[PDB]
Amino acid sequence: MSPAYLKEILEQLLEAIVVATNPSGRLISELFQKLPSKVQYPDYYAIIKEPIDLKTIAQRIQNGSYKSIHAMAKDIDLLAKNAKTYNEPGSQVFKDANSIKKIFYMKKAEIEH
Numbered sequence: 786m787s788p789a790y791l792k793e794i795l796e797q798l799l800e801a802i803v804v805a806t807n808p809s810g811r812l813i814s815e816l817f818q819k820l821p822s823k824v825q826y827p828d829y830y831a832i833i834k835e836p837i838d839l840k841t842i843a844q845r846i847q848n849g850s851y852k853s854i855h856a857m858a859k860d861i862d863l864l865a866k867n868a869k870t871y872n873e874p875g876s877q878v879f880k881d882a883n884s885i886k887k888i889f890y891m892k893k894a895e896i897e898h
């Protein structure tokens with residue numbers, strides 16, 4: 786797998802996350818694009834040791850920082866676990882975080898097989 790080929794794969798995986806809509810038609814990715822401000826939400830950074838967001842993941846795809854699909858999955862897992870730590874089970878953020886993971890792993894299995 787060439788770097789250029791891998792990049793296309795990772796772009797597809799990210800694309801599936803950011804175009805995914807809920808049953809209501811809303812785009813679940815939007816809240817996860819950019820980390821919450823440190824001024825307004827210090828508690829987030831009190832709790833989350835490794836903040837990450839989809840814009841950072843997107844930069845890393847664009848910079849070639851991921852050397853495999855698994856590398857990108859690690860950051861997807863980190864992002865969802867961070868969300869599921871700061872927010873309660875069943876809260877919309879918690880549920881959307883799982884949905885993003887779901888979308889990623891489904892599309893990863895679609896590509897890998």
Ligand SMILES: Nc1nnc(-c2ccccc2O)cc1N1CCC[C@@H](Oc2ccccc2)C1
Nearest residue numbers: 816817818819820821837838867868871872878
């Ligand atoms: N809750 C959040 N949880 N994770 C993130 C997050 C963003 C990017 C990447 C990983 C993440 O975990 C952002 C979040 N907020 C943004 C919107 C405002 C505030 O949330 C509220 C506030 C009041 C009521 C309901 C929700 C903070």
